[PDB]
Amino acid sequence: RSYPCDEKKQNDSVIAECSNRRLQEVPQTVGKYVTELDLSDNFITHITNESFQGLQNLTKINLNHNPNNGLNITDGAFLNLKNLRELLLEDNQLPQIPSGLPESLTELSLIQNNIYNITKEGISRLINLKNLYLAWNCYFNKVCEKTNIEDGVFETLTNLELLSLSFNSLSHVPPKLPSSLRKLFLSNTQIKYISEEDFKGLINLTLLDLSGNCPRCFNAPFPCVPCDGGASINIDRFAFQNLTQLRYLNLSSTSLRKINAAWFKNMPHLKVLDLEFNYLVGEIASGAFLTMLPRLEILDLSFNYIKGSYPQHINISRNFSKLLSLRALHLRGYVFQELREDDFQPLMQLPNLSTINLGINFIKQIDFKLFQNFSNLEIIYLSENRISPLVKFDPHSNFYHFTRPLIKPQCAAYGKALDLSLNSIFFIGPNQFENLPDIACLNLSANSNAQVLSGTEFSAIPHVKYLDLTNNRLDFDNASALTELSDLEVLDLSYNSHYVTHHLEFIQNFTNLKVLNLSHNNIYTLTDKYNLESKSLVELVFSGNRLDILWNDDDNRYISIFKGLKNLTRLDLSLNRLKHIPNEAFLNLPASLTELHINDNMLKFFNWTLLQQFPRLELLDLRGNKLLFLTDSLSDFTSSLRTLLLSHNRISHLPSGFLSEVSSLKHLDLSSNLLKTINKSTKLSMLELHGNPFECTCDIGDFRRWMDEHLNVKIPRLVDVICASPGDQRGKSIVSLEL
Amino acid sequence: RSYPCDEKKQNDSVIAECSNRRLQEVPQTVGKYVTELDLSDNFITHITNESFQGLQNLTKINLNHNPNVNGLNITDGAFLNLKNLRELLLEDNQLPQIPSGLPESLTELSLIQNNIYNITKEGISRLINLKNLYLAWNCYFNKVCEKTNIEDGVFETLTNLELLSLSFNSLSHVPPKLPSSLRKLFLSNTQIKYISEEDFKGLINLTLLDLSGNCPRCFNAPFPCVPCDGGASINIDRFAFQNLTQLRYLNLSSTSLRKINAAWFKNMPHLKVLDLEFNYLVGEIASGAFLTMLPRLEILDLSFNYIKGSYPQHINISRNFSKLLSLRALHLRGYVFQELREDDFQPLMQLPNLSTINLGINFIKQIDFKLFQNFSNLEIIYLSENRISPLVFDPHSNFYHFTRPLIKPQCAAYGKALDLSLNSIFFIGPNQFENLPDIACLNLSANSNAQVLSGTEFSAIPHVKYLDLTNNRLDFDNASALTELSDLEVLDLSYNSHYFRIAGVTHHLEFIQNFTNLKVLNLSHNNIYTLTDKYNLESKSLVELVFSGNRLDILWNDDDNRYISIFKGLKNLTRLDLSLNRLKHIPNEAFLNLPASLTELHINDNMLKFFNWTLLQQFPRLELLDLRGNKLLFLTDSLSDFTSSLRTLLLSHNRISHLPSGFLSEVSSLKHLDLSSNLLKTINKSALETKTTTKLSMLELHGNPFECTCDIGDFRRWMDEHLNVKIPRLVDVICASPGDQRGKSIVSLE
C-alpha cells in the first residue's frame, strides 16, 4: 500500500499521484518501477542528489507549485536519471535555470518562476528538448526590466519543436532560433516590431503567437501598457515570407488598424487566424487580406468595437465570400443595432460555414430569415444581444479566445442550434420564430421571460428536441404547455419563478421526453393533479424544491408524486429540506430507479429495509444529511447497490461486516462522519474515510491491519485520515502510527 | 428579572414580549404590572379561564400563530374574566369557530387565518364596543369552507364598528344589515361578482371600500385564481355608490374591468386613492370619461393592464388626465409599450402637484427625455425594467399595490430622483443624460454597464449627490472617473466586476481623492485584491467606507508591505466595514494604520484566530468593535488599559471558552457585551469583579454550552445582584451538561 502516494498501473507504465499532500520532502517511501511522479502542490523546499536515489525508471517528474523564498535545487540533482524525459518545474520561485539537467529531457517546463537569464550553461546541453516552456518569468516586475537571452542559446536545440516565451519582456524576437521550430509562442513580450530577419527560415513553423504586443488596453481587466500613442504592432511586409506551413496565427490585441495582405502571400495553408481586440472595423468593411486565405477554417474578429459607438449596421466586405474553407466565424463584440439580409450576403455562399458567433453585439433586430439562405449552419450563437418579442488565470489557458464550446454539446448534438439567451425576449411574440430554419436545440435562458405557455408559441419550429428555458419566469400551468414540441427530449426549467402553485400535467403529453430539470422552482404544492406521469422520462432533477412540504401533506395527496414516471432511472431530490421521508412515499418512488440522490437535506433517519423495493438501484447518494445509524444487514436489502455515498453525516458506529456482504458494493464513502474507530469487520475498490475523528489508541490496530490485508481496496487522501485523540496523536495520520 | 418574557416600560405602561419562545402554556410567572402580553409564535395548545388568572389589568393579548409545526383549544368564557381586555389577537390559530363568551370590553378583535365558516350572533353580537373586527382569510381557496355563513344582522348590533374586514372568504354577496358606523369595509377576494344598488346603504360614513379580486384577472396569476364566467368583469350597478359621499379610498384591482362607469363617481367628490391595477383598461386609459369625475384624486394606480401577446409602439393617454388636478402620484407599471414621445404625456404636464410618475416594467425602448423638464413638481421618475439603450402570505400587507418606497429614501432625500435600473444601458452614451432636469439621485443599477469612466459621462447632470452604480461592470481606473460630479456625497459600487466574469481584475482608486464632500463609498464585493501604481485610499471628506467582500487577506499579506496604509489617508473616517475579507491575521502595523478617527469598526465574518487588544490604544474614539463570526480563542485580562472609549463589543460566534478574572471589571465605558454562541461552560466570579462598578447594561450569553452546575451558582447569584444588566433571550441561555439538566434554561436551577 503506497504511502503517502497513490500508485496506479496505466498502459505499460506505472504512475504515482503524490500531489496536494502537505509533504515537506521527496518521500523515500516512493519506489520503484514508478515511472511518473506527481509531487505538485506540496511544501517541498529542497531537491538533492538523494531526493531521487536509484529511481532510474523515472520518466516524468512534476514538482510544480512547491512550496506553498522558494525551491532549492542542487546542481545535477536530476543528472542521475538516465530515462528522464519530462520535468515540470512551474511556480517554484526559481531564480535561474537549474544546473546540469540530464540531456535525456524531451520536455522542460519552467513557467512562473523568476528566471531573468536564459543561458548556454542552462539549456545548451539539452539537445533532445522537443518542448521548452519559459513563459511568465519576467512579467510586470521592477527587478527584471528585460529578460536576457544569451546569443544562440537555442541554436544548439536542433530537435526543438515548441518554444514558449510568452509573458516576459523581450523587446525583440531572439535571433538564432533552430529551424526545427514548429510552434513559437511570443504573447505579451513587448515586441513592437517584427523584421524580415526574425522568422527567416523557420520553414517548419505551424504556429506563431504574437498576441498582446502593442495591446488594445481599453477596458482591459489585467494591467496593460499600450505602445506609444496606442500604435499598432509593426510587422514588416516580408516578415512571414518563408512560413509556408503556418496553420495558426494569433495577432489578438496588437492594436491593428490595417492588415497587410502580403503577410499571407506565402501562407496558403493558414487554418486559424485570430484578430480579436484590435481596431479592424474598417478592415472588416474592405478587407483585401480576405482574398489571401482560401484554406482558413476559423476566423476570429471579436471585440473590435469602437468606443462610444453603437452603429446601426455591421459592414461586412464582399471579400468574405473568398473564404471558401471557412467553418467558424466569430464576430463577438462588434456592437451594432440591426442585422439585415444583405449584410451577410458574402457568407451565404461559403459551403462549410457551420458556426456564426454573434454573441455580445447588443443587436436589437435581426432579419431572421437570412439564416435560411445558408447550406450548412449548425450553430447560431446570439447570446447577449437585444432581441425583443416579435409581434409584427492559467498559463496553459487561452488568455483571449474561448476554451469552451459555444453551446452545450448535449444540445448541439441534436442538430441545428440557436442560442438567444440573455436577450430581451420578455415574452414569446407570435412571430418570434417565424423565419427560422428547422431548429433542434434552442436556448432561451435568462430573458426575464414570463410567457403563459399555451401550446402554440413554438409551432413554427416544432422539431426542437433540447429546449433550455432556465432562469425565466414562465407559466406552465396549462396542460397544453410546450406540447406542440412533440419530439422534445430534453427540457430545462431550472430557476424558474414568478415576477406560487404548479400544475405539472403538461409532462404526460410527450412521447419522447427523456430529461426534465425542475431544479430550484420552489415547488411546494400542485393543483388538481398530484401525480407526475410519463412513460418515456428517464431523468428527473427536482433539487431545490419543497418535498418536505409536499410529503407532510395532511391528506397524503403526494405519496405517489413520482410513481407514474414508469421509465425513471435517475432521480435528484437534493436540497429539498427533507427531515423524514414517510415510508410509503419512499416505496412509491419508481422501482425502475438506478441512481437516487437525496443529498443535502436534513435526514435524521433512513429506512434501509426499503431498498428491497428497488432491485435496480446502483447508486444511493445520501451525503450532507444528519444520519446516525447504518443497518447491520445491507446485503439482505440489496444485491444491486454499487455506490453508496454517506459523507457529511453523523455516523459514529460502523456495524460489523459492513465491508463484508453486501458484496455488490464497489465504492463506499464515509468521509466526514463521527467514526472514532473501525473494529469487527473485498469486492470493494474504494473506501473513503478522511475527516473522521479517529481515536488512535491501540484499538485502531485492527483496522490498520485490515488495510494491509486488503490492498485491492483503495483509500484516497490517506494523509487526511487523521487522529483526533488522544492528544499526543492528535493531527497525525492513522497510517503513520506504530505498534 | 422577568422570565420567560422580556418585560419593559413602553409609554406609560408595561409590556411583556413573550413571543417565539417555545412555550407550551401561558406562563404564570408574568410580571404583575403587565397590561399587554405578546405570546405569539409559541407552542401553546390550551387556553382556560385559569390561563390568565392573576392578570386582571390585561388590556391587550396577542396569541397569534399558536401552536407551531390541531389548533388552539379555547374554553368557553376563557377571557370573560378580564374586565379591561380591549384588543385580542387570535390569528393563525386553526380555530373552527368564534370562541364563545368573549368579554364585551373588546374594541379590537382579530380572527384572521383560522377555519371559521360561521359568523354567528352569540359569537360577536354583544361585543357592542368593537371598533375594528378582522375576519379575513378564513375560507381561502382550499377547500372547505363551503361558503361562509353570515347570520342575518350579526353586525347590526355593533353600533360603534368602524372597520370590518371579511376579505379572502367566499361570500358571493355583500352581507346585509351593516352598521352605519362603518368607515372601512374590506371585501377583497370574496367572490362577489355583482354589486346592487342596495348593497352599500346606509353606509353614509364609509371612507374606504375594497372590492379587489372579485372576478379576478387570472392571467399569469401567482396565487390560485378563479375568474368569473368568460372574461367578465365584476358587475356594479350604476347607482351602487350613489350614497357613499364620504369615500376616500376605492380599490377595484383585479376585477376584470374593461369599462369604468363615470356615474359611479358622481356623488363621491372626495375620492383620494383609486386602485385599478390588474384590469383590462387600455381602452379606458385612452378615452377615460371617468377621469373628469375625480378632481380630488391624489393617487391613481393603473398598473398591469397590459394586453397579452401585445407590445404596442405607443401608449395612448386620454386628454382627460388633465382633469386630475389633485394628482400627486401616477402608477403606470406594466402597460407595456415601446416608445414614449413628448406629446403622449402632455395632459400630465399641467397637473400642479404631480410629484411621482411610475413607469416601471413597461419595456420601453425609447423615451424623449426632455418631456420631463415640463413638470414643475416631479420629484420621482421611476423607469426601472424598461429597455433604454445607450444614446449616441401576510394578510396585513397590500396584496396588489407593492408598498415600499419606489426609491430608497436616503437617495430621494437629496432631491429629484431618476431610476433607470435594469434597463439596457450597457455603456453610457455621450447623449445619455441630455435634456434631463436636474437630477440629485440617480440609479443605474444592473444595466451590464461597462463604461470606462473618464470624467465626462455625467456632465449634463453634474449635480448628482447619490449615485447607485451597483451590479455593473464599470472601469473606474482613470483617476478622472466621476470627477465631473463634484457634489457627490454617496457612491454605491457594490458588486461591480469586469465584463468577462474573469477573475484577476486590478483596481486604481485614485479617483476618490478628488471629491471634497464625498461621505459614503460602498466597494462591497468588488473582489479587490491588488491596486495598481497607488496603494492608498485618500479623502479628507469620507466618513463611511464599506469594504466587505474583497481580499484584504491578500492585500495585507503582501511581501513588500505595499498596503500597510491603504486606509490611513481617509482622515475623517468614522465607520469602516471589513467583513467578509477572509482575514486570518491582521498585521499589527496595518491595524495601527487604520484611521484614528474611527468610531465603528466591523471585522465580522472573517476567520480571525487572534486579536491584539493592545492596539485599541491607538483609537481613542472607538465606540463599537464588531468581531462576530470569527475564530477567536481569548480575551485580554484588562481591556480597561487599552481603551477608555469602547461602548459596544460584539464577539458572538467565536471560540471563547474562558472569561478573564478582572475582565468586565474596572472601566466601565462598556455598555454592551455580546458573547452569545461561544464555548463558555461557566463564568467564575472575576470576571465577576467589583467594586467599580461596571457600567454594563447588556450582556448576551445565549448559545453557550453551560455546565449547570453548581460551579454556576456564583454567576446565577451575580445575576440576581445586578438586575440592571439586561440579559436577553434568557430561554436560550441553556445548560449543555449534565442533561438531566441539558436543555433547561440556566435560571431554572435551585
Ligand SMILES: *[C@@H]1O[C@H](CO)[C@@H](O[C@@H]2O[C@H](CO)[C@@H](O[C@@H]3O[C@H](CO[C@H]4O[C@H](CO)[C@@H](O)[C@H](O)[C@@H]4O)[C@@H](O)[C@H](O[C@H]4O[C@H](CO)[C@@H](O)[C@H](O)[C@@H]4O)[C@@H]3O)[C@H](O)[C@H]2NC(C)=O)[C@H](O)[C@H]1NC(C)=O
Ligand atoms: C452600500 O453601503 C451603504 C452604506 O452602509 C448602504 O446604505 C446604507 O444602508 C444601511 C442599512 O443597511 C442604512 O442604514 C439604515 O438606515 C435606516 C434608515 O434610517 C432612518 O431612521 C434613522 C434613525 O436613526 C434616521 O437616522 C434616518 O434618517 C432614517 O429615517 C435605519 O432604519 C436602519 O436602522 C438600523 O438600526 C436599527 C437600530 O436602531 C435596527 O433596528 C435596524 O434594523 C437597522 O439595523 C439602518 O441604520 C444606511 O442609511 C444606508 N446609507 C445610505 C447613505 O444609503 C448600502 O445599502 C450599500 N449598498 C448595498 C447594495 O448593499
Ligand SMILES: *[C@@H]1O[C@H](CO)[C@@H](O[C@@H]2O[C@H](CO)[C@@H](O[C@@H]3O[C@H](CO)[C@@H](O)[C@H](O[C@H]4O[C@H](CO)[C@@H](O)[C@H](O)[C@@H]4O)[C@@H]3O)[C@H](O)[C@H]2NC(C)=O)[C@H](O)[C@H]1NC(C)=O
Ligand atoms: C385595496 O386598497 C386599499 C387602499 O385603498 C388597501 O387598504 C390598505 O390595506 C393595508 C394593508 O392591510 C393597510 O395597511 C396597514 O395599516 C394598518 C393601520 O395603520 C397597519 O397596522 C399595518 O401595518 C402593520 O403591518 C405592516 C405589514 O404587515 C407593517 O409594515 C407594520 O409594521 C405594522 O405591523 C398596515 O400598514 C392600509 O391601512 C389600508 N389603507 C387604508 C386603510 O387606507 C388594501 O389593502 C387594498 N387591498 C388589497 C387586497 O391589496
Ligand SMILES: *[C@@H]1O[C@H](CO)[C@@H](O[C@@H]2O[C@H](CO)[C@@H](O[C@@H]3O[C@H](CO[C@H]4O[C@H](CO)[C@@H](O)[C@H](O)[C@@H]4O)[C@@H](O)[C@H](O)[C@@H]3O)[C@H](O)[C@H]2NC(C)=O)[C@H](O)[C@H]1NC(C)=O
Ligand atoms: C493565440 O492563439 C493560439 C492559437 O490557437 C493559442 O494557442 C493555444 O494555446 C493553448 C493554451 O496555451 C494550448 O492549449 C493547450 O494544449 C495542450 C496540448 O493538447 C493536445 O492534447 C489534447 C488533449 O485534450 C488535444 O485535445 C489537443 O488536440 C492537443 O494535441 C494541452 O496540454 C493543454 O492542457 C492546453 O489545452 C493550445 O494547444 C494552443 N493551440 C495550439 C498549440 O495549436 C494561444 O494560446 C493564443 N494566445 C493567447 C495568449 O491566448
Ligand SMILES: *[C@@H]1O[C@H](CO)[C@@H](O[C@@H]2O[C@H](CO)[C@@H](O[C@@H]3O[C@H](CO[C@H]4O[C@H](CO)[C@@H](O)[C@H](O)[C@@H]4O)[C@@H](O)[C@H](O)[C@@H]3O)[C@H](O)[C@H]2NC(C)=O)[C@H](O)[C@H]1NC(C)=O
Ligand atoms: C438540469 O439537469 C440536466 C440533467 O441532469 C443537466 O444537464 C446534465 O448535466 C450533467 C453535468 O451536470 C451532464 O453530465 C456530464 O456530461 C459530461 C459529458 O460527457 C461525455 O462523455 C460521456 C460518457 O458517458 C458521454 O455519454 C457524453 O455524451 C459526453 O461525450 C461528463 O463529462 C460529465 O462527467 C457529466 O456526465 C449531462 O450530460 C447533462 N445532461 C443533459 C441532457 O444535458 C443540466 O445541467 C441541468 N441544468 C442546470 C441549469 O443545472
Ligand SMILES: *[C@@H]1O[C@H](CO)[C@@H](O[C@@H]2O[C@H](CO)[C@@H](O)[C@H](O)[C@H]2NC(C)=O)[C@H](O)[C@H]1NC(C)=O
Ligand atoms: C444557455 O445559455 C446559458 C447562458 O449563457 C448557459 O449557461 C451557462 O452554462 C454554463 C455550463 O452549464 C455555466 O458554466 C455558465 O455559468 C452559464 N452561464 C450563465 C451566464 O448562466 C447555458 O449552458 C446555455 N445552455 C445550453 C444548452 O447551451
Ligand SMILES: *[C@@H]1O[C@H](CO)[C@@H](O[C@@H]2O[C@H](CO)[C@@H](O)[C@H](O)[C@H]2NC(C)=O)[C@H](O)[C@H]1NC(C)=O
Ligand atoms: C436601484 O435599483 C435597484 C434594483 O432595482 C434597487 O435594488 C433593490 O434594492 C432593494 C432595497 O435595498 C432590495 O430589497 C431589492 O431586492 C433590490 N433589487 C435588486 C434586483 O437588487 C436599489 O435599491 C435601487 N437603489 C436605490 C438607491 O433606490
Ligand SMILES: Cc1cccc(-c2ccnc3c(C(N)=O)cnn23)c1
Ligand atoms: C462588447 C462590449 C460590451 C460592453 C460594452 C461595449 C462598449 C461599446 C461601446 N462603448 C463602450 C464603452 C465606452 N464607451 O466607454 C465601454 N464599453 N463599451 C462593448
Ligand SMILES: Cc1cccc(-c2ccnc3c(C(N)=O)cnn23)c1
Ligand atoms: C408586465 C409584463 C411583464 C412581463 C411580460 C408581460 C407580457 C406582455 C405581453 N404578453 C405577455 C405574456 C404572454 N403573452 O403570455 C406573458 N407576459 N406578457 C407583461
Ligand SMILES: *[C@@H]1O[C@H](CO)[C@@H](O)[C@H](O)[C@H]1NC(C)=O
Ligand atoms: C540551498 O540549500 C543550501 C543548503 O541546504 C543552502 O546553503 C542555500 O541557502 C540554498 N541555496 C541558495 C542558492 O540559496
Ligand SMILES: *[C@@H]1O[C@H](CO)[C@@H](O)[C@H](O)[C@H]1NC(C)=O
Ligand atoms: C425508456 O428508456 C429506455 C432506455 O433509455 C429506452 O430504450 C426506451 O425507448 C424508453 N421507453 C419509452 C416508452 O420511451
Ligand SMILES: *[C@@H]1O[C@H](CO)[C@@H](O)[C@H](O)[C@H]1NC(C)=O
Ligand atoms: C358618522 O360620522 C361622524 C364622525 O365623522 C359621527 O359623529 C357619527 O356618529 C357617525 N355615524 C355613526 C356612528 O352612525
Ligand SMILES: *[C@@H]1O[C@H](CO)[C@@H](O)[C@H](O)[C@H]1NC(C)=O
Ligand atoms: C397641492 O398641494 C398643496 C399642499 O400639499 C395643497 O395645499 C394644494 O391644495 C394642492 N393643490 C391642489 C390642486 O390640490
Ligand SMILES: *[C@@H]1O[C@H](CO)[C@@H](O)[C@H](O)[C@H]1NC(C)=O
Ligand atoms: C468629519 O465627519 C463629521 C461627521 O462624522 C463632521 O461633523 C466633520 O465636520 C467632518 N470633518 C471633516 C474635516 O470633513
Ligand SMILES: *[C@@H]1O[C@H](CO)[C@@H](O)[C@H](O)[C@H]1NC(C)=O
Ligand atoms: C501588539 O502590538 C504591539 C505593537 O505596538 C506589539 O509590541 C505587541 O507585541 C503586540 N501584542 C501581541 C499580543 O501580539
